[PDB]
C-alpha cells in the first residue's frame, strides 16, 4: 500500500477518524495535511461539548474574552491590519479571463479580479507549504441551506483557526450530521490558513494570527475550490459565506438555472394578516440587516426575517420565485445598532454570540458608536484596541456580531423550510445623498434588471450593480444576460422590481427621511403595488407614489417635493455616468436589452 508511514495521517487525528470519512473528503484532508503540515487533525462534530471545549481553549490562549454581562457571549479583538474583507486581495482563477470578468474597453476592471492559474500556482506555493506547522487543522463539514433542502450545498473547510470553527458553527450548519448527509456526494473544497506557522517569525498583535502581506482569497470554480490565506476576518475566513454562497454559488447558479445574490429575505404582513416575501440587494453597510429585522412603526404591520445577507433563489415548477437563506446566523455590523435602529438585533445578540472588535465595559458588556445607551455611573470602557477609552471610536467601524438566526425574536416560521419562500418583489438601493428619490418602481423586467445594473452607492459614489460588485463569481455581462433570461422562462411569475434610497440629504447635509422602522411606510406602498393598487405615477425613471399614496402621517415635516423630486440636470448626469461605466466595464458583453434601457432612460430624460 505504501513503502513507509508516508501519507497516512491517522496518528495525528485528535478527534474523529480518517477511516470513517468519505474517500474524497479523506483525500482532501490528507493531501492538505501533507502540504500544510499541521501538528494535529481535528474533525469537527459540531457538538456543544466541542464548542464548549474550543471556547475554553481560546480563552486560555487569550484569543477571546468572555463577556460576563451576557449568557455565553465572547469578544475577539483583531490585529488592526485584519479588520474586514479586502476586495483587492480577492481573486478568481479561470483559464480564460473573460469567463470571470468582461474585458474592459479602456480601463481596469472593477467587476472582479482575475488571476491566471500560473500566477496563482506561484502565489499558492509562496504561502501554504508548511503553513500550519505547530497548529491544529480543523475539518469543518458544513451545509449552506437546511440539512435536506434541494437548494442546499455542502462544503468542507480546513482551517487552523478555532475562531473560524466557532464562527462557522453559528453561521452554518456544522458537524457530523453533515458528513452523514454528504456521503459520496460532491462538496466545495475550502482551504483556509492564518499563515503563521510556529514558531512565529513575526510578533502577534493582540494574539490575533494573520499575515496581511500575504493575504489572498482565491476562488477556482472549475476545481470547486476556495483557498484563502492570511486573514482570519469574516468574509475572508468564513468561506461558506461570501466565497462559497456568493462567488462559487453564483457561477453554479448560472450553470444550473438559479440565483445567488447579496439579498436579505423578509416576510411582511399587513394589518389584515396578508403576507408577502420580499428580497433586497443593498451594498455592504447600506441597511440590509436593519430592513430584514425591522420593527415597523405602522400599526398592524409585521416584519419577519428569513435572512439578512445572502439569498439563493430559483423558479419552482409553478413559476414562483423561491428563496432560501443558506446561512444559519447573522454576521451583522455592530456600530449603529441600537434599541431604536434595530431593537430585534439587540434582543438576539445577548446570548451565544461572538463579537469581534467592539468595546467592552468594565461590567462585562459591549459598547460601540451609535449604541445610544447610557452606561451607569462608574462603568468604564475598553476600546477594541485594548486601551482605556473615553468620549478615536471605541469600536472598529466594521466591527461585527456573530449570532444564531434561530434566536431572533422575529425569525420567520419558514426560514428553514426546504422549499423556500415565494418572492413577490425585489428591492435595489444604496447611499445616494442627492437626486435619487425615496422609492420608485421599474417599468418592466428589463428596466428592472437595468436598475440593478445601474446601482451606485456612497463609499465618492461607487458603482455596485446588484450590490454584487465584490461578489460576482463570473462575467457580469453574462450575469445580466442570466437575469434577463428569467423573463423567457415559461410560466415564471416575475417579481415586481423597486429601487429605494434611505439616504437622500438636504443642503444642510442631514437626512430628508427618518428611515429604519419608518421604512415600513415605503414597504406598505410596495405591498399595495404588488396587489395592483392604482397608487403610482409615471415618471422618466419609473413609477413613483402618487400624491398622498404614502402614509406620511406623524413624521411630520417630510419635504415630499424634495424627497421625490426628479431633476433633469441630475438625471442627465446620472445617465452619462451609467453609460460611461457600462461601455468601459461591460463593453462587448453588455446585453442588447440593457443598452436599450439605457437609451430609453436617456430619451425619457431628454423629454423633460
Q: Check residue 333 for interaction with ligand GTP (CB under 6 A).
A: yes
The pairing of strands 173-174 and 136-144 is antiparallel
Check whether 53 is labelled as a binding-site residue. no
* SS3 assignment, position 83: coil
Residue placing its CB nearer to ligand SPV in the complex, 284 or 295: 284
Instruction: Tell me the C-alpha distance between 445 and 87, whole Å.
Output: 30
- Would the annotation count 565 as a binding residue? no
Nearer of residues 193 and 342 to ligand GTP, judged by Cβ: 342
Name residues contacting Mn ion, limited to 323-382 (CB under 5 A).
Answer: 332
Which of ligand GTP, Na ion, ligand SPV, none does 241 bind, CB closer than 5 to 8 A by kind? ligand SPV
Count, residues near Na ion per rule CB under 5 A: 4
Q: Residue 233 or 277: which CB sits closer to Na ion?
A: 233
**Residue 357: CB atoms within 10 Å:** 27
The Cβ of residue 406 has, within 10 Å, a number of other Cβ atoms equal to 12
Decide if residue 386 touches Na ion (CB under 5 A).
no
**C-alpha–C-alpha distance, residues 304 and 288, integer Å:** 13
- Select from Mn ion, ligand GTP, ligand SPV, none the partner in contact with residue 314, using the beta carbon and a kind-dependent cut-off of 5 to 8 Å: none
Could you say which of ligand SPV, Na ion, ligand GTP, none residue 77 binds, taking C-beta under 5 to 8 angstroms by partner kind? Na ion
Contact pick of 206, 297, 398, 587 for Na ion (by CB under 5 A): 206
According to CB under 5 A, which one of 110, 177, 207, 417 is a site residue for Na ion? 207
How many C-beta atoms surround the C-beta of residue 318 within 10 A?
10
Grid cell of 317 as nine digits: 415548477
Rounded CA-CA distance 142/199 in Å is 30
For residues 498 and 516, which CB has a smaller minimum distance to ligand GTP in the complex? Answer: 516
Of the CA atoms within 13 Å of residue 251, those in its CB half-sphere come to: 24
Which partner from the list ligand GTP, ligand SPV, Na ion, none does 114 bind, CB cut-off 5 to 8 Å by kind? Answer: none
Would you count residue 309 as binding Mn ion (CB under 5 A)?
yes
Question: Minimum Å distance from CB 431 to ligand GTP?
Answer: 8
Which of these segments, 37-45, 110-118, 201-209, 307-315, binds Na ion (CB under 5 A)? 201-209
Short-list 240, 343, 244, CA closest to 289: 343
Q: Do the Cβ atoms of 188 and 202 come closer than 8 Å?
A: no
Active-site residue among 44, 73, 131, 286?
A: 286
Question: Judged by CB under 6 A, which of 287, 365, 470, 477 binds ligand GTP?
Answer: 287
- Output the smallest distance, CB 76 to ligand SPV, in A: 13
Active site residue 286: yes
* Closest among 405, 411, 445, 442 to 321, alpha carbons compared: 445
Pairing of strands 216-220, 225-229: antiparallel
- From Na ion, ligand SPV, ligand GTP, none, which one binds at residue 313 (CB under 5 to 8 Å depending on kind)? none
E strand or H helix at 169: helix 162-171
- For ligand GTP, the nearest residue by Cβ is 515
For residue 338, say whether it is annotated as part of any ligand binding site. Answer: no
Within 448-507, the residues that bind ligand GTP by CB under 6 A are 502-503
Of 504, 498, 499, 514, nearest in space to 432 by CA: 504
Minimum distance of ligand GTP from residue 275's CB (angstroms): 22
- Is 287 marked within a binding site? yes
Q: From start to end of 326-395, where are the E strands?
A: 329-333, 354-356, 359-361, 366-367, 381-382, 388-389
Instruction: Work out the angle at residue 492's Cα, subtended by the Cα atoms of residues 603 and 481, and round it to the nearest 5 degrees.
Output: 50
Cβ proximity to Na ion: between 116 and 206 the closer is 206
Residue with Cβ nearer ligand SPV (18 or 217): 217
516 marked among binding-site residues = yes
**Residue 235 annotated as binding?**
yes
Residue from 73, 77, 190, 410 in contact with Na ion (CB under 5 A): 77
Q: Using CB under 5 A, which of the segments 106-114, 221-229, 302-310, 545-553 binds Mn ion?
A: 302-310
Residue window 34-73: x/- pattern of binding to Na ion, with contact defined by CB under 5 A: ----------------------------------------
3-state DSSP call for residue 207?
A: coil
- Cβ 516 to ligand GTP shortest distance, Å: 5
Closest CA to 230 of 199, 192, 201: 192
Find, among 449, 454, 453, the residue nearest to 486 by Cα: 449
Provide CB contacts within 8 A for 40, sequence distance 6+.
Answer: 12, 13, 14, 135, 136, 137
587 annotated to a ligand binding site: no
Q: What is the residue whose three cell numbers read 486573514?
A: 231
Q: How far is the CB of 186 from ligand SPV (least distance, A)?
A: 24
Q: Which of 109, 143, 231, 289 binds Mn ion (CB under 5 A)?
A: 289
Cα–Cα dist 338/270, whole Å: 25
Burial of 88 by CB count in 10 Å (0-12 exposed, 13-18 middle, 19+ buried)? exposed
Binding segment toward Mn ion, per CB under 5 A, in 282-290, 349-357, 453-461, 519-527: 282-290
Q: Which residues pair with 15 in a beta bridge?
A: 42
Binding-site ranges for ligand SPV (CB under 6 A): 85, 234-235, 241-242, 284, 309, 331
Nearest to 465 by CA among 452, 448, 483, 474: 452
Task: Report the DSSP pairing between strands 65-66 and 74-76.
Answer: antiparallel
CA dist., res. 321 & res. 136, Å (int): 43
Contacting ligand GTP within 506-545 (CB under 6 A): 511, 515-516, 519
Q: Give the residue carrying C-alpha cell 475550502.
A: 190
Q: Would you say 204 or 434 has its CB closer to Na ion?
A: 204
CA 558-464-215 angle, to 5 degrees, is 130
Binding-site residue total for ligand GTP (CB under 6 A)?
Answer: 20
Which segments are annotated as binding site? 85, 233-235, 242, 262, 284-290, 309, 398-400, 431, 516-519
Binding site for Mn ion (CB under 5 A): 284, 288-289, 309, 332
Binding site for Na ion (CB under 5 A): 77, 206-208
Residues with catalytic roles: 286
Which segments are annotated as binding site for Mn(2+)? 242, 262, 309
Amino acid at each position: 500500500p505504501q513503502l513507509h508511514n508516508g501519507l497516512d495521517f491517522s496518528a495525528k487525528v485528535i478527534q474523529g477518524s480518517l477511516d470513517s470519512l468519505p474517500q474524497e473528503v479523506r483525500k482532501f484532508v490528507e493531501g492538505n495535511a501533507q502540504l500544510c503540515q499541521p501538528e494535529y487533525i481535528h474533525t469537527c462534530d459540531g457538538s456543544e461539548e466541542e464548542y464548549g471545549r474550543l471556547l475554553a481553549h481560546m480563552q486560555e490562549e487569550g484569543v477571546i474574552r468572555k463577556l460576563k454581562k451576557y449568557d455565553n457571549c465572547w469578544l475577539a479583538l483583531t490585529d488592526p491590519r485584519d479588520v474586514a474583507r479586502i476586495e483587492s486581495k480577492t481573486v478568481i482563477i479561470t483559464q480564460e479571463q473573460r469567463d470571470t470578468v468582461p474585458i474592459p474597453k479602456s480601463g481596469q476592471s472593477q467587476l472582479g479580479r482575475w488571476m491566471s492559474e500560473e500566477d496563482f500556482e506561484k502565489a499558492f506555493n509562496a504561502r501554504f507549504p508548511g503553513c500550519m506547522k505547530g497548529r491544529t487543522m480543523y475539518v469543518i463539514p458544513f451545509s449552506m441551506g437546511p440539512l435536506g433542502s434541494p437548494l442546499a450545498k455542502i462544503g468542507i473547510e480546513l482551517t487552523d483557526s478555532p475562531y473560524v470553527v466557532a464562527s462557522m458553527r453559528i453561521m452554518t450548519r456544522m458537524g457530523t450530521s453533515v458528513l452523514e448527509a454528504l456521503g459520496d456526494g460532491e462538496f466545495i473544497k475550502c482551504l483556509h490558513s492564518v499563515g503563521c506557522p510556529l514558531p512565529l517569525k513575526k510578533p502577534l498583535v493582540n494574539n490575533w494570527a494573520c499575515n496581511p502581506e500575504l493575504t489572498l482569497i482565491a476562488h477556482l470554480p472549475d476545481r470547486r475550490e476556495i483557498i484563502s490565506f492570511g486573514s482570519g476576518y469574516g468574509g475572508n475566513s468564513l468561506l461558506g459565506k461570501k466565497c462559497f454562497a456568493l462567488r462559487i454559488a453564483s457561477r453554479l447558479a448560472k450553470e444550473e438555472g438559479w440565483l445567488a445574490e447579496h439579498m436579505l429575505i423578509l416576510g411582511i404582513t399587513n394589518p389584515e394578516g396578508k403576507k408577502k416575501y420580499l428580497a433586497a440587494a443593498f451594498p455592504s453597510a447600506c441597511g440590509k440587516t436593519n430592513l430584514a429585522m425591522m420593527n415597523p412603526t405602522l400599526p398592524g404591520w409585521k416584519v419577519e426575517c428569513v435572512g439578512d445577507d445572502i439569498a439563493w433563489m430559483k423558479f419552482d415548477a409553478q413559476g414562483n420565485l423561491r428563496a432560501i437563506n443558506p446561512e444559519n446566523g447573522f454576521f451583522g455590523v455592530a456600530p449603529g445598532t441600537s434599541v431604536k435602529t434595530n431593537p430585534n438585533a439587540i434582543k438576539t445578540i445577548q446570548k451565544n454570540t461572538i463579537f469581534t472588535n467592539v468595546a467592552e465595559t468594565s461590567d462585562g458588556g459591549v459598547y460601540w458608536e451609535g449604541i445610544d445607551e447610557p452606561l451607569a455611573p462608574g462603568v468604564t470602557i475598553t476600546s477594541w484596541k485594548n486601551k482605556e477609552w473615553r468620549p478615536e471610536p471605541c469600536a472598529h467601524p466594521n466591527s461585527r456580531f456573530c449570532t444564531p438566526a434561530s434566536q431572533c425574536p422575529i425569525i420567520d416560521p419558514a426560514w428553514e423550510s426546504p422549499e423556500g419562500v415565494p418572492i413577490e418583489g425585489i428591492i435595489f438601493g444604496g447611499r445616494r445623498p442627492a437626486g435619487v428619490p425615496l422609492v420608485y418602481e421599474a417599468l418592466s423586467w428589463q428596466h428592472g434588471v437595468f436598475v440593478g445594473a445601474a446601482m451606485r452607492s456612497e463609499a465618492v459614489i461607487m458603482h455596485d450593480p446588484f450590490a454584487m460588485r465584490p461578489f460576482f463569481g463570473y462575467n457580469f455581462g453574462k450575469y445580466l444576460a442570466h437575469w434577463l433570461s428569467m423573463a423567457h422562462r415559461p410560466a415564471a411569475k416575475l417579481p415586481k422590481i423597486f429601487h429605494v434610497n434611505w439616504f437622500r440629504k438636504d443642503k444642510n447635509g442631514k437626512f430628508l427621511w427618518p428611515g429604519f422602522g419608518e421604512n415600513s411606510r415605503v414597504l406598505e406602498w410596495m405591498f399595495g403595488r404588488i396587489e395592483g393598487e392604482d397608487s403610482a405615477k409615471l415618471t422618466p425613471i419609473g413609477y413613483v407614489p402618487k400624491e398622498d399614496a404614502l402614509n406620511l402621517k406623524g413624521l411630520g415635516d417630510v419635504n415630499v417635493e424634495e424627497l421625490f423630486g426628479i431633476s433633469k440636470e441630475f438625471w442627465e448626469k446620472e445617465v452619462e455616468e451609467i453609460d460611461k461605466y457600462l461601455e468601459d466595464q461591460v463593453n462587448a458583453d453588455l446585453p442588447y436589452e440593457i443598452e436599450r434601457e439605457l437609451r430609453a432612460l436617456k430619451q425619457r430624460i431628454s423629454q423633460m
